């Protein structure tokens, strides 16, 4: 089954369709575009009746060839009625937001977070005790780390997620959401964490208020700076080997280039293309133990994107040891596959 033949590109959510004739992705044209076609495209990506809006935007990508729509066709697929074209009647392409995400109301050495600042933050408990966190990306799905749900914890009935709550003493049974499924990455290597990402599904979909909201996943072609201004949060130990924090802290870290994070005085080429370091080589800010899987978000275009998820580290209050996170950008396709293949 191969059905990831449509995608959104970059911060503007430029809908694209794949053409084997040119073996390239071409943005769709806005002329004669049905909005129900946009709804269908959103469903074909794994969105349970989640559709925000479609609008025409002058192409913000770098494609000279487009995909015009044949309105004389009928009862065919999206790729069947789209034909290659080098221009648009209206100088605008299709922009497709398939969900309302990325809006928020606005850890060692990280100031406490206010309610509504990081609504996607999740605290996952195993035995009424917080093990690690995740990220709300959909009323049902959560993005976390694979090393969190290693055996014996790979069964879905151990876990209960507490989203919308910032206090760990107010996370009582009957406040969280039982997890239906836990879908770790098949290519997760425990010895050397490479594809350390995992999912979680809830029996009861989350209701989104100012306190609870999703975080946009990174579409392809997200031009991020070599040192982009990111944010982290979680209930980790504020002191090396300290106890779990009662309150949800936040910190302002900066992405570190992979070419620099693999030097000899650093993790020494241990970082694979599936991982992204963040933090400071000087130190004083990192995601310590207890906030694994936690969000690493970045703001761009008024949207917070799940850049990565906490994976591992060699120490928190240390220099030349930035936090290492999974590259959610790499895993977005697998995430979409697992979200589509729900039920079958």
């Amino acid at each position, epitope marked *: 089954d191969e059905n990831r033949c449509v995608r959104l590109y970059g911060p503007n959510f430029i809908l694209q369709v794949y053409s084997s004739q040119r073996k390239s992705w071409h943005p769709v044209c806005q002329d*004669d575009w*049905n*909005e*129900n076609y946009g709804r269908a495209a959103c*469903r074909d990506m794994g969105y*349970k009746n989640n559709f925000y809006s479609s609008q025409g935007i002058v192409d913000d990508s770098g494609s000279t060839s487009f995909m015009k729509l044949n309105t004389s066709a009928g*009862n*065919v697929d999206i790729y069947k*009625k789209l034909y290659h074209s080098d221009a648009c009647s209206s100088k605008a392409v299709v922009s497709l937001r398939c969900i309302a995400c990325g809006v928020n109301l606005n850890i060692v050495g990280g100031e406490s977070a206010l309610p509504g600042a990081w609504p996607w933050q999740v605290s996952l408990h195993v035995q009424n005790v917080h093990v690690c966190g995740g990220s709300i990306i959909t009323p049902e799905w959560i993005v976390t780390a694979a090393h969190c749900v290693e055996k014996p914890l790979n069964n879905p009935w151990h876990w209960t997620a507490f989203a919308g709550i910032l206090r760990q003493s107010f996370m009582f049974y009957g406040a969280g959401y039982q997890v239906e499924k836990v879908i770790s990455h098949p290519n997760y290597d425990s010895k050397t964490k490479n594809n350390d990402i995992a999912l979680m599904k809830l029996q009861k979909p989350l209701t989104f208020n100012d306190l609870v909201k999703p975080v946009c996943l990174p579409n392809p072609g997200m031009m991020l700076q070599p040192e982009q201004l990111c944010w982290i949060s979680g209930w980790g130990a504020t002191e090396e080997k300290g106890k779990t924090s009662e309150v949800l802290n936040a910190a302002k870290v900066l992405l570190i280039e992979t070419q620099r994070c693999n030097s000899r005085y650093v993790y020494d080429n241990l970082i694979t293309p599936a991982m992204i370091c963040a933090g400071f080589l000087q130190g004083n800010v990192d995601s310590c133990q207890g906030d694994s899987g936690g969000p690493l978000v970045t703001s761009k275009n008024n949207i917070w994107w799940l850049i990565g998820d906490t994976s591992w580290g060699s120490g928190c209050a240390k220099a030349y040891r930035p936090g290492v996170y999974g590259n959610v950008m790499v895993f977005t396709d697998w995430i979409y596959r697992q979200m589509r293949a729900d039920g079958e």
Partner: antibody
Amino acid sequence: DQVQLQQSGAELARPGASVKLSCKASGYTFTSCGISWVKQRTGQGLEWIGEIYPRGGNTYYNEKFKGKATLTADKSSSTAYMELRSLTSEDSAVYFCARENGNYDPLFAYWGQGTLVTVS
Amino acid sequence: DIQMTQSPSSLSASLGGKVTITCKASQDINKYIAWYQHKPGKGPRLLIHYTSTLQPGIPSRFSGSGSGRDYSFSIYNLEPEDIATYYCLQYYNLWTFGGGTKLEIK
């Protein structure tokens, strides 16, 4: 085979009760397309209730009918359902089950035979 | 919600003549209008989709047209078989029907 969307027979129920209509579909891959429910009233003309997609259960509803209707489907049996709650004096219509041509052609080319729902 | 206002609400037409039923939209639906027949108990039948196409096996005397927010649908040489409550449907954003028009001979 002509794509057939046999609906349940005409039914009646007391006000404030619930009626669960069914529309069994044959002649096409039930999971491939989507099924719509269209209301037909005397004086009020035709109206649109919502859409059910058997592949994943994705549902779309009209503003008026939120809560009043609950679309449902079961892929294995190959038949879709629409549940009406708190039926009242004005919920007496000939509800039509219609299959849209395709996911990229939302045209109601095929329709059910009709199921006159009346409220006591 | 793209509302639609179909007029005239009813028309006593002349057999063997001509008639045109007007439908208008609350948005630009990119000519994604469809026209359905409605026999008293034979279920609706699709006639026109996209303002310019008649579903196969349908009389050529049926034809519609339009653009923007106002659309038209006309049928000439009226026969008894054409007595029906015609509707305009937009499938540009969700689905919406017209008000309907009783096409009764005079």
